[PDB]
Structure formats: C-alpha cells, structure tokens
Design a binder for this molecule. Structure first.
Ligand SMILES: *[C@@H]1O[C@H](CO)[C@@H](O[C@@H]2O[C@H](CO)[C@@H](O[C@@H]3O[C@H](CO)[C@@H](O)[C@H](O)[C@@H]3O)[C@H](O)[C@H]2NC(C)=O)[C@H](O)[C@H]1NC(C)=O
Ligand SMILES: *[C@@H]1O[C@H](CO)[C@@H](O[C@@H]2O[C@H](CO)[C@@H](O[C@@H]3O[C@H](CO)[C@@H](O)[C@H](O)[C@@H]3O)[C@H](O)[C@H]2NC(C)=O)[C@H](O)[C@H]1NC(C)=O
Ligand SMILES: *[C@@H]1O[C@H](CO)[C@@H](O)[C@H](O)[C@H]1NC(C)=O
Ligand SMILES: *[C@H]1O[C@H](CO)[C@@H](O)[C@H](O)[C@H]1NC(C)=O
Lengths: 910, 909
C-alpha cells in the first residue's frame, strides 16, 4: 500500500525544509530508492513517442538505424544521469525539485540557465502531450467527430490540422483548468497513469510473444508492390462477388470511375498488376526482420512500396488510396522525433524532499530507471522489426490495417487496450508537465535570480503558481498552433538537449577547474563521462537542427551572462565593477583550496619603496628594475611605510599612494600599491613583508634598496633596520633581492649595447640565482647582454660533475650561458660553509672580513666591468650585536662593483 | 618612382625595430597612406574569384541575390575593418605585420588564435590561387596541354581533376622554390601584379561601356531553349552547306549518328526544335537585365535553359553537347564560393613598420580599400546582369562561347587581356600568400606563445622561414588535392571568417569590460559595430557550413585555452594554480582602472578576531555573525594580530592561521585569513585596518567585538584599544560594526521563531543602518523576524529618502518616529553640526544624563528585541575623554540583549 506521486517539488517544499531547520510528519513521506526515484522517472520517461511514433520510426529507419538512434539518445541520457548523480551526491541535497539541486551545486547562473531551458522543454512537452492525446482521440478513437471534415483529397491534411488546432486549444484550456483547480487529484492519479503505461507495455510484450506461433489476422490490401489503404475497402480483391454476381469491388470504384465495369476505363497500374492480401503481422519466426533491416527514407508524397511483391513497370496512375509517406523523413529528423521519449530524467529527483538517503536513492534510482526504459525501447525496436510487416511500419496514422493503432496490433487482448492506455498516459503526462512547468517557473522567480520574472513569483494560498501557469499555457498554445508531433518534437528535444548539455558541461568544468565545494562522492563519475555526454548530445542538438541549436545556445548564454551580471550587481553593488570583483574573488577562492607549493618557482615581487620626509619615492630605480625583472607580467605589490600616526596622516597616505601609482604607471609596472602609516618604519616594514596580498596571491620575494650611506649617517637606525628586514624576510621563508647602487640601474627607455650579467653561484640557493638572469634577459633592456656563471665550488674535480648538472639544467632553460668554476680556499668561503653546515644540521668577524676581501679580489678580477653582478648572500648573524660586522662584511664584499643584486633564497626554491 | 611591396612584415622586422630601440635607414622606407595601406589592401583583396566565378555567381543567383551576397560579405569585412582600425589606433602600432598589432592589442591568447586561423586561411588561399592559375591556364589558355585527355562522359568530368591535381602540385612545388629562393623578386614585381589587376578591371569596365552602342559578336548556338556547347560546332545551323550542297552540319553528327543525312535517325528534341544563334553579349541598353534578375539554382547535371526562346515539348534526347550545371548550387553555397574575394583586409596593415602615421594611414586606407573593392564587386554584379546573356553566365567553364572566359567577353581590346591578367594576378596572389603564411607562422613560433611550434621558429640566414614554409607547402598540397575552387573556397572562407569573428569579438569584449590599455582612439568606432560584424559573419560561418564552422570554433577555442594555459605556466610556474592566479590578477587589474566608488554600497567585512594568550579565537561568534551577515557571498577578510616578535613566532603564526581557517570553514565563512605578528596589538590592528586586501578588493567595514569587562580589568589598554580602533576606522573612512554581548549571538544551526530587529535610525548615517537588517534577514537564521525602525530625528529630507529606499527594498518594515528632546541627543546633534560645518567649509555629565534618557526610551521600546542596531556617536577629539566616551557607550547599551553598534563615517548610499 502506497500513495506516491510523480510530480515535482517546488518552492513550497524547499521553504518547508528551511523553516523546519529549527520529524514525525516528514518521516511518513520518506520513500525508498525504488518508489522515490525509479517510479517517478519511469512514469515520466515513458511518453507518447513509444507508441504513436516508435513503430513509424522503426519502419522508416530500418531496425539497424532505429537501434542506432535509440542507442545514441539513451547514451546522452545515461551520461547525463551519471553527471546528475554526481551532482546529487555532492553536498546536501535540497528538499526542492531537481532545479534546487542543480542550483545549489552549479551556482545560480547555471541553475537559472538550466531552469529556464528545462522549463521551455516542459512547456513544449505539455504541448506535445496534448497534441498526442488529441491525435489519438481523433485518428483512432472517434474519427467521425472532427469539427472540420476533410475537404476533397488535397485539403484532407489541412482539415485535420485545423481539427487538431481547435481541439488542442480547447483541451489545453481544460487541462489548465484541471491543474489550476485540483492538482491533488493529479498527485492521486499519477499511480493510475503509471499503471496504464505499464499495462500497455506488458500488453505490447505479450503480443510480441504471441506473434511467434499465432500472429493476429490484420491483413493489408496491396496492389503489386503498391500498398493500399483499407479505410473504405472491404475485400482485397479486384472484383467482389455479390449475390452470385461478380460485381466490381469498391477498390475498382477507387481506381476506375465506371463503378459498374461496363467497358470500364481502368488506369494502367490497376489493369497490369494484382491486388493481394498480405498478412500484416507475420510471425516473429517468419524472418521479416531481414526484409525491414534497412532504411526507407522516402520523401514526401511518395507511395509506400513493399519491396517483396511482383510489379509491372507502367506509372502515372496516381490515386488517393495509395498510402503515402506523410513527411520527408531522414535520420536527423528521426532522432529529433524520438528524443522526447528519453527525456524526463530530471524527474527522478523531482521528489527529493521526501527521501531517506538522497545521495544513494537518486543516482541508483535514476540509472536503473534509464536502464529499464532503454531496455524497453531497444527491445521494442527489434520486436517491431521482427513482428510487423515492412509496410505497416511506415504507416504513420495506422492506415492500411483497417484504421487500428500500429503498435496496437501487437497486444494480447486487443489493440483497444493500447489505444486507450496511450491516451490516458499522454493526457496524464500533459497534466504532469502543466504542473511541473509553472512550479519551476515560480521557483526561478522566487529565487530573485532574474528580476523581471518576479511577477511570476506570485503564488496561491497553498503556494501554487497563479501567474506562472498562465505563461506556461500561452507557450503551450504557441506550440499547439503547430499541430503536429513531428514538428513539435524537434523543439522540445532541443530545449531538453540544452538542459542536459549544461548539466554535463557544468560538471565537467567544476571537476577540471577544481571548483570549491565540488566533492562528487560517486563510485563511477569521471569527468570524461560527463564530457562525452556533453559532446554526444551537443552533436545531437546540431544534427537535429543547426539553426534552432544556435538559437538555444545563444538564449541560454544570454540568460547565463545576465544572471551573472545581476548577481554581481546584487552582491558587490555595481554591474561591471562588481562583475570583475566576483571574478577576482572566485579565482582567489579556487586558488586557496590547492597545494600551497608550485612545481616551478617564479619570483612574485614586493618592492619596498622608501618614502622620504617629502613623501616622494627615494628610489624609482627600484620600480624600473622590478619592471625589467617581471617584464610587465606576474604580480608586483609595491609597498611603502609612512612614518607617523595614522589618525592624522590619512590625507598624506592618499597623496603618496597616488604618487606611487603614477610612478608605477610611468615605469610600466603592472601591479598594486599599498601604504602603511606606522609608528616605526621597521615595524611597518615587518608588517608589510608578512601581510601584503590577499591569500593565495602572496608574494615570495622582497625587493629592497641598499641602505646607501649607512656609515655616514650618525643614526644607527638606518643600517639596523635593513638587517631587521633581512631577518624578517629570512624568517618568513621569502626570497630576498637587495639591490645596491640602484641609482645606476638602467631606465626602461635606455638599453645596453653589450654587457655581461655575472651571476655568482655560491654553494647553495642556486635555483633563484640561475633563474634570475634569464628573466632579466627576457626584457629588451638586458636582451643584448651575455651571462657568465663564476661558480666557486671546490677546485675542478667536483666542478666537472656539477658542470654537467648546470649545463644540462641550462640546456633545459635553452638560453646561452657559459659557466666557469674558480677554485677558492674553504677559509675564504668560511662564512658560507658555516651557514651551510648550520642548514644541514637543522634539516670570527676578523676572519669574515679577511675572507670577504679575498672574495673581493676574485670577484673584481673577473667581473669588474659587468653590467650587473648577482651574488649569493650569507644569512644574518644570530646575535644582533654583530649586525654592524655583518653590514661591514656586505659592504666590503660589494666594494668596487658597479651594480650588485645581493640575493638570498631562504626558502624551498627550485 | 617607387618600389613598394604588398607582402607582410614578420618577426624579422619586429626584431629589427626592437634592436633599433637604441634613423636614416628607417626613414627611406617610410610610405604615405595611399601607397602604404590603400594599394596593398587593394592588391590583396582583388583575388581570382572576381573573374573565374563572379559571372557564374551572378548568373546562377540572379542580380538581386548576387547583390545580396556581395553586400553581406562586404558588410562583414567592413565591420571587421572598423574593428581592426580601432585596434590600429589604440596604442603604439608595432613594426611587424597585422599579427603583431592584433597581438599587442588583444593579448597573446587572441593573438595566437587569430594568428593560426588567419594562417590556415592564407595557406588555403595559396592553394585556391594555385588552383585558379592552373584552371585558367588549362581550361582557357592551353587546353591541348592537359596530361589526362578527358574520355567518355563520366570519365571526362573526373579526367580534369587528375590534370588539375598533377599541375597544381607541380605549380606549388615551383612556387615554393620561387619563394624560398628570391622573395626579393616577388617584392619587386608586386607592382606589376597590381598593374595587371587594375588593367584587367579597367578592361572589364571599358568592355561594359563599349557594350552600350557596339556590343561584341560572341554568339551562342541554342537548340530551342537548350543551350549547346560551341567547342566543336562551327555553324549554329542544322545543315552546313558545302560546295553548293546542303550537307548536314557537325551538330547533326552530335545529335544524329548517320552523319550523312541518308535517312538519318535524329533524336526527338533535334527533329522538333530549331538551332538558333542568340547574341551572347547583348547591348547594355538591350535590357536583358530584366531577364536575368532572378535566381536559377538548378541542381547538378541539369541542362541550362534560357526561358525566353521558343521550344517544343518533347524530351528524352539526352546528349553530351548540352551544357550542364557542373555543381549543385544554392545560396549558402554561393556565399561560401564568393567570400574569398573580400578577404585580405588584414593585408592593409601588413606593411605597418614602413609607415609614417600608422594610426592615421591604416584606418582610412583600409576602409577606403574595402569601399573601392565593394563598389567594384557591386558594380560588376549589375554590369554582368545587364550585359551578358542569362545563359552564358551560368557557364562555369566558358562553354557555349567557343571556349572563352565569360568575363573575358566583356573587354575593350579582347578577352585575351583579361584571361592573361587574371592568370598573372592569381599566380602573384599565390606567391603573396606563400610568403605571407610562413612569415606569420615564424612570428607565432618566435613569440613562444605556443611551445610545440618552436621547431618552426627556425629562420634562414636573412630571417626567412625554412621550416615554416615547408609546413605551409604541405598544407597547400593537402588543399590542392581537392582540385576544385568550388570546394576549397568554403574552407578558406571558414578560416578567414573565424579570424574576423575573433577580431570583432575581442574588440567588443575589451570595450565592454573596460580592459586596461584599451583606448580606441577612433572617430567612429563603437562596440556595437564590432558586435554587429561578429554576429553577421558568425551567421555567415554557419550558413556556409555548420560542421566546418563548429570544427573551426573548437580548434580556435582549444588553441586559445592552450595558449592561456601555457602563459600561466610560463609566468606563475604552474598550470592550473597559475591559471587561477592569472585570472585573479587580471580581474584585479581591470578592477583598478575604474571609478573608485560604486553606485550602491555593500558591506565588505574585515572581521577583527582577537587572539588570546593561548592563540585561540577569543570570539568565534564574530565569524558566525559575519557568515550570517554576508550569507556566504562577497568578500570577508578575517584579520588578527599576534602580540610578540615575528622573528621567533612564525610557527605560532602559521598554527593560528590554520586554526582561524578551520574556524572560518566551520562557521561557513568564505574568505581569506591574514595574521600580523606585531609588537603592539594597537598598531597591528591599525595596520590591518588600512592594509588588508589587494588594491580594488578592499574592505569597507570593520567588524569588532566589544571589549567586555573593560572596567574590571585593571589595565586600561583593553578599553583604550577599542577606542583607538574606532578612531582608525573613522579616519580611514570605513564603516564600523561593533558587536556587543557577542557570546549570545545565534549560531549558524539554530534559528529565531519570531523576533524584531529594532534598527534605531538616528539623525545620520541612515544608509548603512537601513541596509544591514535586510542583509541579515536574507539569511535563514534571521529569516523569521520582523523589523521596526524607531526613528528619533537634513534629517527630514533623509527620512523621506529612507522611506523611498524602503519601498525600493520591498521588504516589509514599519517606521515609528519618537519625539526626543534635542538635549537627550545632544552628542549626536553636536557631531552632526561638526559634520555640517566641515562640509560647508569644503559636557560629559550632560552626555551621560542624556544617554540614560536614550536608555529609557530604547529599552522601553526594544527591551525584548532579538538584535538592536544602533547608530554611534564619534569618539571625542581629545583622547582624555575616552573613558567618558566608553561610559557613554556602555550606558547607552545598558540593558539590551544583543547590540550591533554601527558607525558610518563614510559616503554610504
Ligand atoms: C515497385 O514497382 C515499381 C514499378 O516497376 C518499381 O519502379 C521501378 O523500379 C526499377 C527497379 O528495377 C527502377 O530502376 C530501374 O532499374 C532498371 C534495371 O535495369 C533500369 O533498366 C531502369 O532504367 C531503372 O533504373 C525504376 O526507376 C523504377 N521506376 C520506374 C518508373 O521504372 C519500384 O522500384 C518497385 N519497388 C522497389 C522497392 O523496387
Ligand atoms: C524549356 O522547354 C522545355 C520544353 O517544354 C520546358 O519543359 C517543360 O516546361 C513546362 C513549362 O512551360 C513545365 O511545366 C509545365 O507547365 C504546364 C503549364 O500548364 C503544365 O500543364 C505541365 O503539367 C507542366 O507543369 C514542364 O514541367 C517542363 N517539362 C516537360 C517535360 O514538359 C522547360 O521548362 C523550358 N525551360 C524553362 C526554363 O522553362
Ligand atoms: C522552328 O522553325 C520553323 C521554321 O523556321 C518554325 O515554324 C517553328 O515554329 C520553329 N520552332 C519553334 C519551337 O519556334
Ligand atoms: C495476381 O494473382 C492472380 C490470382 O488470382 C493471378 O491470376 C494474377 O496473374 C496475379 N498477378 C499477375 C501475375 O499479374
């Protein structure tokens, strides 16, 4: 015993859930995976197409191509089921319909795009289902009751379309009234609709089985290889004997105008060929599948010909009774006509609020439902191929079989069971989609995702959409005006295909780009699956119509970008400003949930500009050299401290910030400026070094200017601060670039004709040292200079192996660089070796000076005339007392060189 | 006297310019706008189509639809010229070709995508032009020298393709050798090629004019309304009299097998109808335009029928001599066949290094060249409509006119001048595109934009592409293997259409989004024009082929994203990490060059978390309330100061940072964390308030916790620091949110059944105060509460504005104005007066005794509220009355459950 439904859950349920945040009523609607996602999805996938058009598709395509069609459609819907299950498992499943899940999983932009595309899909589905119910009623149930009787022969089709337009509009107004007043009854009879569907399918299978030994007696009159209609004929014989008199049969009256055979003038094909009674349903074992295993694709108005019977060759006798191909078929048309029979998988999660284990019921339920329907379709394709005559299949309105439903002829009790079950199922699906479309529309309106749809957010006392339904009815009316399933199906299929394409593309993107909160806890979801689904039914979209598909893509893209713009204006306050703001925030967030390190190290600079008492940059050269080092790309944060109290220096801070920005723009520096008004310059710099940049966009190198004239100034703060900053940089594990004699650094406009960047590679931190000159040489200023590595390791035997390691590394760099190893006494490099030993264990002053002068001797003797001498640095002393000695060591170590870039790694650089 | 060229300038010139950075040689190549951009673009737009296929297109389309085709193509190329001129004016024009301009203007990603699409365009153009030169030579000049003689009927049709494939491959190997050895000669003879083109067009016009009084004698044999070929027939008469004997003419031998008229068995149409000589070029005044003003679109193999002359009705006599439609035409096919006649506008700026005023010569020159060629095409459409028979036009191989070029029949001297000028022009354009494709390829390789193309960066001693040219030759070979202009034209057109679509879309985007360094100094460029061009010829792309267009779009998109990825990995060091890094940096940069303010104010929070001596968050409720306030969207920077020395507390700073990040994620706060290890807590907070966030992603509100138990603690620093922070926030012009009794603030899981957020709106700063409760109510926790505004006081004007804002907000709120004595609100009115005074230029016992009145009213009205917002008075000017200020605040909030003290201190709207 159970009282379930197959409809959706709109804003009413999501709202109840949110309020219920802070139960016995909830527990009772809890439904297992089977009755929660299997039956809703099964009742909503099994549409009208399976009946009114599957036999026709099989016939006009040949079992092979029909199998290919059903397989491609089922493949796009199965990969979309996998992507939708990945969405369902990821995070908490909201209580609303599939729209709320898709929204909370893919962001409001994709949520709204999918919502509107799926909504247009559902409206045109309510239109197709009303057209189908009308077509079944009118062609098969009550043919006599058509308001416009067919006029002559040429206007017979036109008279039918008007019957369908008027009857469909009346029926649509009826269905709208039903859904508006008494949707509870629709919920109650969803089970009866599913019952009708399943009874119909079991009747189809029972007929197919019975058709092996005893097939039914539905014969078709056929003149040679020309199939005849049986809507008016009684006997498939040229002369029907009446009262022992061989009077001509009615077909004679339809091919010869005499009607009395008194010297009757019969046309050519009638006199030459012969009328035969061909069994319309041969046995399943008869082996007709070999006959109908091939496409027909006859264009419009072509006579349907069974390529088995004999025939004469005369032509010209065009007649009304010849059953004709009613539409110029093709593969790309058949795929579109059949696709709305696999749609409805988003209905699997239309009952997600009343579930027990959502992430477990929704994926399994949906995939099992799609497997069931795919098996039913792929089995019925072959059964129709192997049970129905190759002529009764191409009959798209049950003609030539005495006016019975083509699939109806395959049934155990009678074709009547199917002709009524299809009608009830199709009107039920129309009601279902006229309840599912306006609920989704009011949910998209209530979310305030799109502003102008706010009007449709209005609900009834119970939370039913009063003003969304009217728009749904209007769109269904526009659809019904094209009173033909064969022409509504491509549009419906295109809208549902766009919905499925976005559901597959959002999952592929969010898996590749490592989108935050994208944890697809599924045992079989791989982004390649969703990508293959997106590709497959993108191809499907374009195949069916290349112009409708572009219109759908552009509509969805405009809705997506407009939702993004509205979200920007909502959260940041401005449209385009806020749009870039959201882009930056999202990039930084995505940047946070990732490995902290990088496979390669690239210097992101923090230029520490020193501001004089006039609040002017004391060293613009710093900015010029930073621009040359980064070459206008990358991150450059220009930081500076203004000594004083912030409470009264805000105006000065703003003025100096404008000054530094103008200077950066003048020196082609692309980056950002940050001023800190601090009580102590040293503490301000210690705060800039560790706090600049938003998380994930941190710097990793600190670029400083050398404290020129440290000895001259009586105050010891200037030299002591530089050391403090060096210690802060080393402790923070950031790289350090101390530029000395920066006033002589070349400007952005001038250039070097010829020169040598003499990188000095000393025991360690070789990665930063080697990487620097190439970044410099990549700029036009340092472009025309060479590079010389004066390695100072051991003597020569060690160097040969190292020479190979450096030469190959440089080979990977692919920039010319000659390395020379100069033997140096360990004592001369004692301070370095000491620091290295301290590092290895972790993982005097007179000697330092007397060795620094040896370093001076070698460095000047080799590199006196260099344009820029890079040089590795030793760490600062542990005791802050020897800071003067450390600065003297550095000053002597750099005595006599034109332009030095002291470099200290102090990090895991490679 | 001048020696100019129409070829491109690749990496060799761009490199010379860059080196020449730090002249007499440069000055000499300087060329004026006319000879620098008008003639190169004119010489490169006038291709082979104008001759070999324009007459055929006019005929098979009808003058009206042919006019529509030429107009649509010219419209896409003109809008693309406007966008490309906008690119040319914006910024300095690089010395290289058009590729370098497009690159430096649209970024390397679009630069490389457009470069490769335009490169495939140029290669398939070298293929089409070689095919055209071969077709002209073989069909019109020397038919005798064809290696595969046509045989039978079906074999004869495919006999030609083998002649064309072999001759085209031979010609392509010849052209490749020429360009490889002696491109200087091509530069020298570019002028002769342009001369041939212009002489040919003037010959067309002279023929059209002469066709007014005296049209030429090109007759066509026509059997009834069935056109015959005249390659073998001599007289358009059934019987050709020989030696005074009426012997049957050869056409009799081609329709009757007797050949002696001895009881000859002639077929049906031949016996019934008549052969007639129809003047093939009637006068311009003859008025045939009225006849050929309509489309034909006859499918493949259909006999071409003039619907004017008499005819019998018998059918069945299918014959070889009946001129047949050689391809199943359609409108969408004609647009594709014709589009490669308007391509070449990027060649206008292929000589930009040798210019005087680039930003002035390139736009005018390009637009004038396109106007000239568009007028020439639209004029020749009408001239062909009004001068050539409606049957001679649909002849795509000069049949029925004795085997002469269709357009050749319209010329003053003879069709030979055009048939040779077209051949030389088409081989010259082939040479041009076999020099322009590899130069562009080596420029894309040398830019190191795409890695794997590095092999093709290799150049010759003079800087000629040795290995790029070979790939161009291979692709041209693959093109020539499809030995038919009618099938190469759609591919060429698709590649050039993709190039133009990207050039229009990048400009539209960079104009809309306010991309940095996008200054389009043009007098007529509006982004709507580039957008209309993008749309027009996107439609053109898809019309011509919906599957080729998708393949091109996917190829270009993959190249674009791959270039972006390679640039990320190059500059940042990682692929996806660096990709997000570049996205963030670019967004922030774009965010910088814009108005600092915003039309709406939205609170971007900086939560100041206080870290205790255990390095644990002393107030997680701060984060919970920040999450509720921002609702998971927006910017939230959580800042905290660790008192101590940074040299030894780095590990502690990292540990506490991980702690704060875990807490943020636990409280559903989406944002970033920044720790500052400072010697003094007050200075650390004063530095966080002014330095957090990258430029453009700044905060505008500071969210603080109230210093609970300030009086109890003997140390006065705790209460004094809060005031210091308030002053820092006010001075920085940021909003301020002081939360009091924050330990009682509701958690993210619980909710309120019913309650009232009692926003108290006092004289000023009404914008922040009104905006807050609605952002709070937008969260599920505060969803089920009501709002009550207890207004106490241009305050009257402000109240009306607030009411209007409430109406705009559309969320139910009831406002009550309570009369209060000015003395009670004295501290507020005093501050307001100070504000008005400063704006115009551009005690304690009373404050406490009035604060208690404020307490009386506020508690009597709002004692049971769930959250009482309340405006704040400014801190005293003298830092001595700071205790008095804190006492004022403490009493002002005495008795309320949960208070959010709010201070605007900014231009909040
Ligand atoms: C159903 O019967 C009609 C009536 O004869 C068939 O029409 C004709 O069928 C032939 C196939 O034999 C078609 O092709 C012809 O083939 C012969 C083979 O030598 C060839 O000599 C002819 O020139 C022609 O190509 C023919 O086009 C078709 N129509 C006419 C007017 O003759 C029809 O094909 C039969 N159904 C099927 C499925 O074959
Ligand atoms: C060139 O001359 C031939 C020889 O008659 C034309 O063939 C026939 O042309 C007629 C049009 O005059 C076509 O349509 C017919 O129209 C009459 C009008 O009443 C109608 O009674 C017929 O049933 C038919 O629809 C006809 O299809 C066509 N072919 C045959 C076999 O008659 C040919 O059309 C002429 N060329 C042009 C461009 O018109
Ligand atoms: C063919 O020529 C004869 C005599 O010149 C003429 O009478 C007849 O009408 C012509 N046929 C047609 C179709 O004009
Ligand atoms: C059709 O079948 C009949 C048997 O009544 C036969 O006489 C007639 O010849 C058949 N058609 C043929 C062979 O033309």
């Amino acid at each position: 015993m159970a009282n379930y439904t197959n409809l959706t859950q709109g804003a009413k349920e999501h709202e109840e859930a949110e309020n219920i945040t802070e139960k016995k009523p909830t527990k009772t609607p809890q439904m297992g995976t089977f009755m929660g996602v299997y039956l809703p999805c099964l009742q909503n996938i099994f549409g009208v197409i399976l009946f009114l058009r599957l036999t026709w598709v099989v016939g006009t395509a040949g079992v092979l191509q029909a199998f290919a069609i059903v397989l491609i459609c089922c493949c796009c819907t199965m990969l979309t089921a996998i992507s939708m299950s990945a969405i369902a498992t990821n995070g908490v499943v909201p209580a609303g319909g599939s729209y709320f899940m898709i929204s909370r999983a893919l962001g409001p932009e994709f949520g709204g795009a999918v919502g509107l595309c799926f909504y247009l899909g559902t409206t045109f589905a309510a239109a197709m289902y009303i057209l189908g119910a009308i077509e079944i009623f009118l062609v098969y149930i009550v043919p006599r009751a058509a308001i416009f009787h067919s006029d002559d022969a040429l206007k017979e089709s036109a008279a039918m379309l008007n019957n369908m337009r008027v009857y469909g509009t009346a029926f649509l107004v009826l269905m709208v009234l039903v859904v508006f007043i008494g949707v509870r009854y629709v919920n109650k009879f969803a089970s009866l609709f599913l019952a009708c569907v399943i009874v119909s399918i079991l009747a189809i299978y029972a007929g197919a089985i019975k058709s092996s030994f005893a097939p039914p007696h539905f014969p078709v009159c056929m003149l040679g290889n020309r199939t005849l209609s049986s809507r008016h004929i009684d006997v498939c014989s040229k002369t029907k004997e009446i009262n022992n008199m061989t009077v001509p049969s009615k077909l004679w009256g339809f091919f010869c105008n005499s009607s009395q055979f008194f010297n009757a003038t019969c046309d050519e094909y009638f006199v030459h060929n012969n009328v035969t009674s061909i069994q319309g349903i041969p046995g399943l074992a008869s082996g007709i599948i070999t006959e109908n295993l091939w496409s027909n694709y006859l264009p419009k108005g072509e006579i349907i010909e069974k390529p088995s019977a004999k025939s004469s060759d005369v032509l010209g006798s065009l007649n009304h009774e010849y059953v004709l191909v009613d539409i110029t078929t093709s593969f790309t048309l058949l795929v579109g006509i059949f696709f709305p029979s696999v749609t409805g998988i988003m209905a699997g999660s239309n009952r997600s609020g009343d579930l027990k284990d959502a992430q477990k019921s929704i994926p399994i339920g949906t995939i099992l439902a799609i497997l069931t329907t795919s098996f039913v379709y792929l089995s019925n394709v072959v059964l129709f191929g192997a049970c129905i005559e190759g002529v009764v299949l191409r009959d798209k309105f049950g003609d030539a079989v005495k006016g019975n439903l083509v699939v109806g002829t395959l049934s155990w009790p009678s074709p009547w069971v199917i002709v009524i079950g299809s009608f009830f199922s199709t009107c039920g699906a129309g009601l279902q989609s006229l309840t599912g479309a306006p609920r989704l529309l009011q949910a998209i309106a209530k979310d305030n995702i799109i502003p102008f749809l706010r009007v449709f957010g209005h609900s009834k006392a119970n939370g039913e959409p009063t003003w969304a339904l009217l728009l749904t009815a209007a769109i269904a009316e526009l659809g019904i005006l094209i009173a033909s399933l064969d022409l509504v199906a491509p549009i419906l299929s295109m809208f549902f295909l766009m919905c499925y394409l976005f559901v597959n593309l959002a999952c592929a993107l969010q898996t590749l780009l490592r989108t935050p909160n994208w944890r697809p806890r599924f045992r079989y979801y791989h982004w390649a699956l969703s990508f293959m689904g997106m590709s497959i039914c993108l191809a499907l979209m374009f195949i069916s119509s290349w112009y409708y598909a572009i219109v759908a893509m552009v509509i969805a893209g405009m809705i997506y970008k407009y939702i993004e713009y509205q979200g920007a204006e909502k959260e940041w306050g401005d449209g385009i400003r806020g749009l870039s703001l959201s882009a930056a925030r999202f990039a930084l967030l995505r940047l946070e949930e990732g490995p902290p390190h990088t496979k390669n190290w690239r210097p992101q600079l923090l230029v520490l500009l020193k501001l004089d008492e006039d609040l002017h940059v004391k060293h613009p050269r710093l900015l010029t050299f930073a621009s040359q080092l980064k070459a206008g790309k990358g991150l450059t944060i220009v930081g500076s401290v203004i000594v004083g109290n912030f409470l009264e220096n805000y105006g000065e801070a703003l003025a100096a910030e404008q000054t530094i920005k103008h200077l950066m723009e003048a020196e082609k520096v692309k980056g950002f400026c940050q001023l800190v008004v601090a009580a102590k310059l040293r503490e301000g710099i210690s705060h800039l070094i560790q706090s600049c940049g938003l998380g994930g966009m941190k710097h990793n190198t600190v670029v400083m200017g050398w404290p020129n004239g440290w000895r001259q100034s009586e105050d010891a703060r200037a030299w002591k601060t530089f050391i403090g900053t060096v210690r802060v940089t080393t402790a923070a594990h950031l790289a350090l670039l101390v530029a000395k004699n920066i006033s002589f650094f070349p400007s952005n406009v001038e250039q070097f004709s010829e020169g040598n960047i003499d990188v000095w590679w000393i025991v360690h931190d070789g990665g930063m040292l080697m990487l620097l000159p190439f970044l410099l040489k990549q700029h036009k200023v340092w472009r025309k200079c060479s590079i010389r590595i004066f390695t100072v390791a051991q003597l020569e035997d060690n160097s040969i192996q190292m020479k190979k390691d450096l030469a190959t590394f440089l080979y990977h760099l692919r920039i010319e660089a000659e390395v020379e190893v100069v033997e140096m006494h360990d004592s001369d490099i004692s301070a370095y070796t000491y620091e290295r030993d301290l590092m290895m264990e972790q993982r005097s002053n007179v000697r330092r000076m007397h060795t620094a002068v040896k370093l001076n001797e070698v460095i000047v003797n080799k590199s006196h005339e260099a344009k820029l001498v890079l040089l590795n640095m030793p760490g600062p002393p542990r005791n802050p007392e020897g800071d003067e000695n450390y600065m003297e060591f550095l000053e002597v170590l750099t005595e006599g060189l034109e332009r030095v870039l002291l470099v200290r790694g102090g990090g895991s650089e490679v």
